[PDB]
Amino acid sequence: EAGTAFIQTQQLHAAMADTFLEHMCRLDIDSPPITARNTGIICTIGPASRSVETLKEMIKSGMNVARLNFSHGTHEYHAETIKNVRTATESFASDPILYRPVAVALDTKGPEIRTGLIKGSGTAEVELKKGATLKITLDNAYMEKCDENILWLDYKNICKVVEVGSKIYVDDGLISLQVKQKGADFLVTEVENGGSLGSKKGVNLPGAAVDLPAVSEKDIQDLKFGVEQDVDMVFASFIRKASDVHEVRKVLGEKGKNIKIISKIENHEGVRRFDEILEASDGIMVARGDLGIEIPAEKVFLAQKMMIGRCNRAGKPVICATQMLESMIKKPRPTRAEGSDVANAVLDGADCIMLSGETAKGDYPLEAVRMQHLIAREAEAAIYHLQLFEELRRLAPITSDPTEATAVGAVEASFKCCSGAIIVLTKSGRYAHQVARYRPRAPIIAVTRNPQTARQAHLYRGIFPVLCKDPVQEAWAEDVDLRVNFAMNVGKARGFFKKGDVVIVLTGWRPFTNTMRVVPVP
Amino acid sequence: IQTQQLHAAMADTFLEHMCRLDIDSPPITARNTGIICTIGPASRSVETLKEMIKSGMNVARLNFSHGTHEYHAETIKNVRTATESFASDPILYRPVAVALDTKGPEIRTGLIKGSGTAEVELKKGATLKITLDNAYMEKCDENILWLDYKNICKVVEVGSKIYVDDGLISLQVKQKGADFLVTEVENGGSLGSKKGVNLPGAAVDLPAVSEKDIQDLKFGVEQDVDMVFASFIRKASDVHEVRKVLGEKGKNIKIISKIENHEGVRRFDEILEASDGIMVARGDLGIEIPAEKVFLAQKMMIGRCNRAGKPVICATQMLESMIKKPRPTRAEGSDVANAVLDGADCIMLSGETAKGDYPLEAVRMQHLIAREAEAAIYHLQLFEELRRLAPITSDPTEATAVGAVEASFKCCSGAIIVLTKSGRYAHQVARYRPRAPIIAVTRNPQTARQAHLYRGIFPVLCKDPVQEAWAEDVDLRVNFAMNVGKARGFFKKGDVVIVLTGWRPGSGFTNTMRVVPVP
Numbered sequence A: 001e002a003g004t005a006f007i008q009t010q011q012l013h014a015a016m017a018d019t020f021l022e023h024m025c026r027l028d029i030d031s032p033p034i035t036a037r038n039t040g041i042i043c044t045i046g047p048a049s050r051s052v053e054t055l056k057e058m059i060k061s062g063m064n065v066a067r068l069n070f071s072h073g074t075h076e077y078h079a080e081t082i083k084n085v086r087t088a089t090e091s092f093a094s095d096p097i098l099y100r101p102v103a104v105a106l107d108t109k110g111p112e113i114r115t116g117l118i119k120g121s122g123t124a125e126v127e128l129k130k131g132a133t134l135k136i137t138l139d140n141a142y143m144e145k146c147d148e149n150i151l152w153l154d155y156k157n158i159c160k161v162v163e164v165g166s167k168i169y170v171d172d173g174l175i176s177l178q179v180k181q182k183g184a185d186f187l188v189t190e191v192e193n194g195g196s197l198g199s200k201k202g203v204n205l206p207g208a209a210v211d212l213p214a215v216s217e218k219d220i221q222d223l224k225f226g227v228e229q230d231v232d233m234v235f236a237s238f239i240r241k242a243s244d245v246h247e248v249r250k251v252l253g254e255k256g257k258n259i260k261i262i263s264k265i266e267n268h269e270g271v272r273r274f275d276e277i278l279e280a281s282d283g284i285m286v287a288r289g290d291l292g293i294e295i296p297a298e299k300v301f302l303a304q305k306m307m308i309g310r311c312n313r314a315g316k317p318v319i320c321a322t323q324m325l326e327s328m329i330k331k332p333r334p335t336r337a338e339g340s341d342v343a344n345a346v347l348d349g350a351d352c353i354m355l356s357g358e359t360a361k362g363d364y365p366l367e368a369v370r371m372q373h374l375i376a377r378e379a380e381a382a383i384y385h386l387q388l389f390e391e392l393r394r395l396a397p398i399t400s401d402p403t404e405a406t407a408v409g410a411v412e413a414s415f416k417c418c419s420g421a422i423i424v425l426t427k428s429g430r431y432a433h434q435v436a437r438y439r440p441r442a443p444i445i446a447v448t449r450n451p452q453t454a455r456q457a458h459l460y461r462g463i464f465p466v467l468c469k470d471p472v473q474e475a476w477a478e479d480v481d482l483r484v485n486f487a488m489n490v491g492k493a494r495g496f497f498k499k500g501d502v503v504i505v506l507t508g509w510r511p512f513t514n515t516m517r518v519v520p521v522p
Numbered sequence B: 001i002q003t004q005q006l007h008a009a010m011a012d013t014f015l016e017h018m019c020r021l022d023i024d025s026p027p028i029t030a031r032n033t034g035i036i037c038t039i040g041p042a043s044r045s046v047e048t049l050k051e052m053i054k055s056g057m058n059v060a061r062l063n064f065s066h067g068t069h070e071y072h073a074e075t076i077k078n079v080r081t082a083t084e085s086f087a088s089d090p091i092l093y094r095p096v097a098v099a100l101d102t103k104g105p106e107i108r109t110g111l112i113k114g115s116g117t118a119e120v121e122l123k124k125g126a127t128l129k130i131t132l133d134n135a136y137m138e139k140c141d142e143n144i145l146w147l148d149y150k151n152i153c154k155v156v157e158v159g160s161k162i163y164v165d166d167g168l169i170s171l172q173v174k175q176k177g178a179d180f181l182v183t184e185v186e187n188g189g190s191l192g193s194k195k196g197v198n199l200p201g202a203a204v205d206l207p208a209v210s211e212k213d214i215q216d217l218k219f220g221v222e223q224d225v226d227m228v229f230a231s232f233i234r235k236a237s238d239v240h241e242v243r244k245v246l247g248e249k250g251k252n253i254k255i256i257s258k259i260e261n262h263e264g265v266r267r268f269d270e271i272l273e274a275s276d277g278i279m280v281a282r283g284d285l286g287i288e289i290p291a292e293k294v295f296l297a298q299k300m301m302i303g304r305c306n307r308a309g310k311p312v313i314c315a316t317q318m319l320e321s322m323i324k325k326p327r328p329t330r331a332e333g334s335d336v337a338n339a340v341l342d343g344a345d346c347i348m349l350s351g352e353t354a355k356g357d358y359p360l361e362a363v364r365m366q367h368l369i370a371r372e373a374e375a376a377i378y379h380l381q382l383f384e385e386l387r388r389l390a391p392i393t394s395d396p397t398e399a400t401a402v403g404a405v406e407a408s409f410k411c412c413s414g415a416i417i418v419l420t421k422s423g424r425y426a427h428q429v430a431r432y433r434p435r436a437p438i439i440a441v442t443r444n445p446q447t448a449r450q451a452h453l454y455r456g457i458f459p460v461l462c463k464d465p466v467q468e469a470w471a472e473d474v475d476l477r478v479n480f481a482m483n484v485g486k487a488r489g490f491f492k493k494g495d496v497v498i499v500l501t502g503w504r505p506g507s508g509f510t511n512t513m514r515v516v517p518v519p
């Protein structure tokens, strides 16, 4: 009864524009998005978020992956976090239609440089003043006696790799020092950017050739523990070259061969060697914290868009990470730059977005998850699929692989009929990954019986994994129908589609494969 | 490898354009995006303003939500002293514009009672009375909060939500009185003095231009400001009211309408038509509408301003953490770059330069990011779309401008030089978004200041007398631009520049294009 005043939902007016400029001009704050949110949300778990009750609310608010940051905490601490994640996740298991799988990710310490403890108890801070002198020492006598005159750090070969004039950054790149003099085991620096210095802060040496191993002996111990704990993926810090990826993957053994290896790109060499790293990895994280200290801050967006583009071209997941909603560590609403950053990561093409301190340590973890969910849904509708899908196709090789032809045909069909979903029956995730790389607007409901697939599949934009718990039926056709009906019930229960809407169904492995059907929802 | 992201520039698709972006491809010297800096205690001294100018400030914004006319007059004096300290060399002098940002129909709280803690704690679930009784205007606390919107009780009802201090505190109306509201704190926090208030669910009925705004606008005319940033513009008639106040004496002052609420977004097209330009005023906007929708409104407004060829400013919290820290967050670096990639003519700093501890670092960081992002634009697609969407006309000047922009891409020119009295001829080039800087030579000091609002325009103020012969006077001004560009490192011998000049004496056509090897 409203009539012509109707505003198309999900930015469909902008979707139909014939140019990108007109697409922008048509973006409409009064055009509401769809229910389904395609971009996975990865949340770092820490003191603010590791209780079972908070984790339950995190899941309800949209967390898909729990990140364990092995830069901090001992193995028993991480074991208990994992236990709590699983308790919270399985509290929803009694209803498979509504159960959301939750993945567990181990983020390695890797070749970090860290300072020691401020003298006293270690919880104090000292003020470093601009122009003051500060001695960096490797003498362990001072490892718990750091102050404004002497700073211990843990990188034993630092004096080899820095020179007079080089810059040393401490604590998220906020404190900056210039090396004035060298010693056998010390550096004399001048404070450039001063500030308040606490304990065990991260140190960066931009332009220095740091020779620490990508995977140290202690990192291997963490990785082995990750295998014992049945983690789903590793986020490997400071990957510089393809062989670093192999050091991570091969040490997991046969037992860990299905764990996904995500290389974190956070230094200049990782950017330069990106193509070989991408080839060796299952996916990528744009680890912007270190990256924006190792390279000039003003260049990070170039590296981010380069890596997202190349991952989209390769069909491998890419995560945008770090400081996306940073002010929400302390405030209940984000800044305008933070809102923009989340939206633009999605528009760039990121498969997942991440929260670090906002969920690990901040005062508003649930609000931060909820805000990522809200922004991602709005941005997903604003993507200019007309151009994106054309470019992904043109840049995608002709092959004889019938499964790739099925996937692109399904995504094409999904756009042609504005489908409510692409339902995909998948054991390993592969068939669903193949659809996701063509970036449909419609959500991809990936039905699997493999619990690890259900967890890992969150890494791909658009995949909404659901875990079927029904026994396998002896008749293949009956077993397919059971899994398809499960997906239909999920989409109806979750509000993705209604009876009578059109959906695409890919029925998976058949003992041709992965037949496509375009059907009304029963 | 190739500088200026030229490898990415040659990609045949946007996706491959992204794939080719190269942190090791260094940008050109020239920075096309104007930087607008709010002046306040951190940045008001002549000494600091000189460094602000050296660091890249193009426009000084004065926020008339605070301060007296005496205070603002002294700020303007200091801006001018700093600007003219560089005037001894017309070739290395940068014009600096002055912008007056109105108070507008703002709602603010009163002063916290000064005998206790400077801020009071509003706790979730507590009662808080909102009063309009001026007896409490300087006695605000956790029990009673005065605000200055005298008609608030008429536009809210039981259940209405009230937001305070960048939308961080929220209250719900529980009961109404003659001159008060009983509220319950929904989202608590620490409350200081004179904080902004938003009523997103209410039809706020304050005037577009209050008596105070009239006084401030007339002061701006008297002070010879270059532009007004008009707060809370909701409709074309609001723009008309501002323009009427500026009047004949202020007729050449640019009116930039600030879009800060839902109605301004809804009525954007009529606002844009009457305005000279637009500010995406994201602070209020992201309280008035859901924070997750701001990027839609930002990209809509930038796109439409680009289609119209009118300047658009991205504003507010772009580098917010630099109020307290010497480096920005990763989201902040991203936000500045994406504003440029979106198409914003200018970017802005508020607390980062007005009140913070690192004003110069904030200006320098906007300069660095803008230059990198300008090189990363996909000009191939942008220029094609701007051409395709432009209004149809046989105007010789427009045709010459488009031809000059295409020529500039074809030879990767060091600059497009254009002569202009009032700005328009340079604006016409800028709207097609060349990669090459547009060196706009003028003898009009106000044009030189205002032209900063347009992406790519590098204004230069020629101070030489007019030459007797028209052709010799044109040549003098072109040669001035050549020497400025050479001295500033924009180009050198062996480069190629595009030169746009007028037809002949007595014509207003800028219809002559020369493609000039740089001597």
Ligand SMILES: O=C([O-])C(=O)[O-]
Pocket (backbone or CB within 6 Å): A237, A264, A266, A286, A287, A288, A289, A290, A291, A321, A322
């Ligand atoms: O390690 C990280 O996640 C980073 O540095 O951004």
Ligand SMILES: O=C([O-])C(=O)[O-]
Pocket (backbone or CB within 6 Å): B231, B258, B260, B280, B281, B282, B283, B284, B285, B315, B316
């Ligand atoms: O007024 C402003 O600049 C704002 O609200 O962003």
Ligand SMILES: [Cl-]
Pocket (backbone or CB within 6 Å): A038, A039, A040, A457, A458, A459, A460, A461, A462, A463, A464
């Ligand atoms: Cl996903």
Ligand SMILES: [Cl-]
Pocket (backbone or CB within 6 Å): B032, B033, B034, B451, B452, B453, B454, B455, B456, B457, B458
């Ligand atoms: Cl400019």
Ligand SMILES: [K+]
Pocket (backbone or CB within 6 Å): A069, A070, A071, A107, A108, A109, A110, A237
């Ligand atoms: K880590």
Ligand SMILES: [K+]
Pocket (backbone or CB within 6 Å): B063, B064, B065, B101, B102, B103, B104, B231
């Ligand atoms: K104002």
Ligand SMILES: [Mg+2]
Pocket (backbone or CB within 6 Å): A237, A266, A287, A289, A290, A291
């Ligand atoms: Mg890191």
Ligand SMILES: [Mg+2]
Pocket (backbone or CB within 6 Å): B231, B260, B281, B283, B284
């Ligand atoms: Mg405002």
